[PDB]
Each structure stands twice: as C-alpha cells, then as structure tokens.
Amino acid sequence: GPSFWLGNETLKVPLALFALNRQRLCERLRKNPAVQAGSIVVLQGGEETQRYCTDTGVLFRQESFFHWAFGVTEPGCYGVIDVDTGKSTLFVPRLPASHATWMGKIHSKEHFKEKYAVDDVQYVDEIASVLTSQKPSVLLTLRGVNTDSGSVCREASFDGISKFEVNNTILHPEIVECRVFKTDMELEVLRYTNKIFSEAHREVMKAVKVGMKEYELESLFEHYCYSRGGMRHSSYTCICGSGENSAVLHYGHAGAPNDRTIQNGDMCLFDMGGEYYCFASDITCSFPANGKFTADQKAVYEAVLRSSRAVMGAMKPGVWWPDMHRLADRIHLEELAHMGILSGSVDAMVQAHLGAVFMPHGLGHFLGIDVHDVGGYPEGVERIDEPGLRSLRTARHLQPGMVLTVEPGIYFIDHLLDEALADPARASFLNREVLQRFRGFGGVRIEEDVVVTDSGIELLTCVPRTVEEIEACMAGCDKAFTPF
C-alpha cells in the first residue's frame, strides 16, 4: 500500500498504520456495552489559522486524534468511521479554481482515496447528506479533558449535525486508551525519530564551543533534523539551557529565548526533540560546555545516570510509575549525601520529601503523537498530592506497548533550596557550606525514550551517556555535517 515519505533517507510510513488504528478503535468500541449498533465515529480535522488579524499563515499541523485515526496532512477535512464495519470516509474541501494558481494542483476525490487508503472520499459540504444516507443510530464525537493542559477536546460540528443523535462522552476514553498502546508500525516511527534526534544530539555535542549562543545550537539541531530527517514541525520549543539556565525546567520560550552565551565551566542541558509526520520524540542530553567534566559536574551527572539506569533496569509490566519516581528520589538523595551536600538518614529525607527539592518535576511521561501524550490519568487513576509526585503526568502501572520518557534530573533551584533551608524538617539535612558551591550550577537531566515490553523495556534512544562517552564524543574531529 501507499506510504508517507519525504525522500532521501527519511522513513516510509505506511498508511496501513492508520487503518490499523481505526480497526483497533472499532474493536474497543464494539466491546463497550453502551455503544449502540449503527454508531459512527465523527472527527473533525484542524483548519488553517493566521496570526492575530493578519494574513500571516501559521504552518498547519494536524490535530492529534484526527492524525492518529487518518494520517491526513491537509487542513479543513473531516473523517468518519462506521463502528460496526470499520468503513472509513474522508471528507475533503471542495476547492476554488483559484487554488490552482496560489496553492497547487486540485486533486480528485479518487486521488485522496488512493493516498490515504480509506474506503470512500466525499466533499465536506456533503457531510450531512452522506451521514444521513447511512442512517446512523448515533454519532460519536470527541469531548474530554486533557490532563496536562486542562483543555477540553473540541467536538466535531457541521451544519445539520443538530438533526442527529450525538454522544460526546463514550469516544474520548476509548480513543485515548488506544493511543496509550503503540502498534509495531507506530514504534517504527518512534525508533526513527529517536535515531534522527540521537544523531542530531551527537552533532550538537561535537559542534558546541565556548562563546556560542544557546540558540546557535538549537538552530543546528533543527537544521539536522529537517534537512536530514524531514522533521519540519516542532513538537515543543527546544530547551538549550547553559549555566544557571539548566535549572529552569522549560527554559527557551519567548520569555527566556535561549540567548545566553555558553561559558567555560558551564553545564549544558539540551532538551531537544520534535516530530516526524506528527509522531513525537523527546530526548535530553547534559554535558560540560568545555568537553571535560569537573569533579562536581561528574558527581551530579553520575547521580542522574545512576537513577536513569536503575529506573530503566526496574521497568517492566506491573511496575507502578510513582514507585519509579520515588526510586529516583532516593537515589538522588543517596548520591547528594555521598557528595556531602546532604547529611543524615536518607529514610528521613524521603519522609520529608527532600527529593522534590532537587527534582520538582515528574520522572517521565507517556510519549506519542503528543510529546506529553494522552491517557496518563484515566478515570480511576488519581494524581498524588505530594511534592514531585504531583507533577507526574501519569500514576499508572506499566503495561506492554506503553511509550515513556525516563528523565530524572537534579537541579539547584534557589527558591526551592531557600524554602527547604527555612524549614526545620528539611534544613538539618542540608550542608549549607557545601551547597553554596552549587548555587548557580544549574542542573542535569538525562532523558531516554523507552517502550514497555512483555519482559522489561526497549530503549529507543542512542546517545553517549557515560562521562567517558560524552567526553569522547565532544573531542571528535568529524563533524561530518558542516553547513557554512
């Protein structure tokens, strides 16, 4: 069958991937006792948007559920699935003649049918007539709450939809659950995005020089990924945090746009990712700007390497993700105590939530079509109201087919350190004279992407990770990729 491809060495993604997702969704819905025979899933694709009141176009990226089901890159579409038969119908815009001048060839419905390997293609202006002729019992539309943004998913609507029976509660939990478990075809794409991003991280480690701006490395990474990987869209704003900026967890946004000069002695924390055909990946590398770890840098870094690998080594089906987060906390505290930053009983430190002072974010998150992927907190799975754990993006137990980031870190964040020092329950653990040396250190984060298997995990990411590996990578002469 057909495949999405951007030529050269980019990955061919079969449109069969989306057909399988549609099948899986129907299979799940058929088992839901509330689902009536004759139901039709109705999804609405994204539309082109512009900047404020201007005619400046925003680069179009498909809505994630719609992509998951159909893989359609064009704006202005709808897609429906007959639950009982699995039959798919794509609705495409009927375009004006002037499109051929400004935008490109006006493709036939048959072109789209072949391109997307759906059962039928119709024009958007006929959606009410077409669905009427199919005599559905109920239209199943998408409405629910994303548990990372708190936003409500936008339900499909079209002129005439008021004449149908519409249910907007059943679909969301079911399609979310399908997205949580990746098919082998989806995993192939995530292996590819990890390959390209792993290569680009290596090129950045090779190219970094003291005196560069953070954004120079962001730019190089993005250029490698687009020109060599076909990765055009960003799945999130890149974090290139040097020096004290590596303690700022989502550094790099408009308010803090990666314009610090990298200095001799800095630690760099490079959290850079993106997507291919709307499949995301998310990798973080930490390394000394000047290519040589100091003793302090080695100690902090190897603490996070230790928790990274202890978590990966423990992950397998049935493991509770919050237990992995607490495992990382305990290891960080042990290592910070060995360094002399902390003293006392690590058991007592854990009871006082001291780990969250050094790792205030969740250990890691589901990954898929969104970087913070859906389904972390389905009905019955509660957020834990404790420091650190409350920021976890899932409190689920692991099952085969889940894709997770594993991203422990240790940071020196002044307002958290200052809170802890003011609190007698935590202050006693902290050795102020040693900690003072680490003020302004920033932090270290090591982020791997993994898939849960029947027996453990498959690591998707492949970057240098030990101190010796990183130092060797940075000292390499072959860049093999020199734009100007």
Determine if 332 is a binding residue for ligand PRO (CB under 6 A): no
Query: Which residue's CB atom is positioned nearest to ligand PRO?
Result: 361
284 binds, among Mn ion, a copy of itself, ligand MH2, none (CB under 5 to 8 A by kind): ligand MH2
Contacts with 342 (C-beta within 8 Å, 6 or more apart), sequence order? 333, 336, 349, 354, 429, 430, 431
Q: Quick one: which of 118, 176, 190, 249 contacts ligand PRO (CB under 6 A)?
A: 249
Query: Which residue's CB atom is positioned nearest to ligand MH2?
Result: 271
Task: Tell me how far CA of residue 195 lies from CA of 36, 200, 216, 326, 409, in angstroms.
Answer: 43, 9, 22, 30, 23
Of residues 364, 132, 397, 405, the one with CA closest to residue 282: 405
461 binds, among ligand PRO, ligand MH2, Mn ion, none (CB under 5 to 8 A by kind): none
Of residues 452, 307, 465, the one with CA closest to residue 388: 307
Side chain identity, residue 484: F
Nearer to ligand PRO, 89 or 246 (CB): 246
Was 67 annotated as part of a binding site? no
What is the nearest approach in angstroms of ligand MH2 to the Cβ of residue 215? 17
Determine if 447 is a binding residue for ligand MH2 (CB under 6 A): yes
Phi-psi region of 60 (alpha: psi -120 to 50; beta: other; left: phi over 0): beta
230 binds, among Mn ion, a copy of itself, ligand MH2, none (CB under 5 to 8 A by kind): a copy of itself
What is the nearest approach in angstroms of a copy of itself to the Cβ of residue 50? 6
3-state DSSP call for residue 225? helix
What is the nearest approach in angstroms of ligand MH2 to the Cβ of residue 407? 5
Nearer to ligand MH2, 214 or 282 (CB): 282
Sign of CA dihedral 290, 295, 296, 300: positive
Side chain identity, residue 291: G
Length of the chain: 484
3-state DSSP call for residue 171? helix
3-state DSSP call for residue 156? coil
286 binds, among ligand MH2, a copy of itself, ligand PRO, none (CB under 5 to 8 A by kind): none
Q: Quick one: which of 271, 275, 370, 449 contacts ligand MH2 (CB under 6 A)?
A: 271
Determine if 282 is a binding residue for Mn ion (CB under 5 A): yes
137 binds, among a copy of itself, ligand MH2, Mn ion, none (CB under 5 to 8 A by kind): none
Nearer to ligand MH2, 305 or 349 (CB): 305
**How many residues interact with ligand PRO (rule CB under 6 A)?**
7
Task: Please give the structure tokens belonging to residue 416.
Answer: 């958290």
Site for Mn ion in 382-421 (CB under 5 A): 405
What is the nearest approach in angstroms of a copy of itself to the Cβ of residue 391? 9
Site for ligand PRO in 266-295 (CB under 6 A): 271
3-state DSSP call for residue 68? helix
Residue 241 contacts residue 289 (beta carbons within 8 Å): no
362 binds, among ligand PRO, ligand MH2, Mn ion, none (CB under 5 to 8 A by kind): ligand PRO
**How many residues interact with ligand MH2 (rule CB under 6 A)?**
7
What is the nearest approach in angstroms of ligand PRO to the Cβ of residue 313? 21
C-alpha–C-alpha distance, residues 138 and 35, integer Å: 9
Was 447 annotated as part of a binding site? yes
Nearer to a copy of itself, 190 or 315 (CB): 190
C-alpha–C-alpha distance, residues 128 and 133, integer Å: 9
Residue 302 contacts residue 467 (beta carbons within 8 Å): yes
Determine if 273 is a binding residue for ligand MH2 (CB under 6 A): yes
Was 282 annotated as part of a binding site? yes
Determine if 362 is a binding residue for ligand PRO (CB under 6 A): yes
Other beta carbons within 10 Å of 392: 22
Q: Give kind and range of the element (H or E) at residue 450.
A: strand 448-452
Was 271 annotated as part of a binding site? yes
Sign of CA dihedral 411, 415, 416, 420: positive
What is the nearest approach in angstroms of a copy of itself to the Cβ of residue 283? 16
Site for ligand MH2 in 357-416 (CB under 6 A): 405, 407
C-alpha–C-alpha distance, residues 218 and 215, integer Å: 5
201 binds, among a copy of itself, Mn ion, ligand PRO, none (CB under 5 to 8 A by kind): none
What is the nearest approach in angstroms of ligand PRO to the Cβ of residue 239? 7
67 binds, among ligand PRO, Mn ion, a copy of itself, none (CB under 5 to 8 A by kind): none
Residue 31: DSSP 8-state: T
Contacts with 348 (C-beta within 8 Å, 6 or more apart), sequence order? 429
Of residues 52, 90, 88, 87, the one with CA closest to residue 72: 90
Was 330 annotated as part of a binding site? no
Q: Give kind and range of the element (H or E) at residue 123.
A: strand 120-123
Q: Quick one: which of 22, 172, 361, 396 contacts ligand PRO (CB under 6 A)?
A: 361
Other beta carbons within 10 Å of 96: 11
Instruction: Give the E-state strand segments of 308-462 in sequence order.
Output: 403-406, 409-411, 443-445, 448-452, 457-459
C-alpha–C-alpha distance, residues 332 and 303, integer Å: 6
Detail the residues annotated as belonging to a binding site for a dipeptide. 250, 282, 372, 393
Q: Write out the binding residues for Mn(2+).
A: 271, 282, 365, 407, 447
Report the binding-site residues.
250, 271, 282, 365, 372, 393, 407, 447
Positions that interact with ligand MH2 (CB under 6 A): 271, 273, 282, 284, 405, 407, 447
Binding site for Mn ion (CB under 5 A): 282, 405
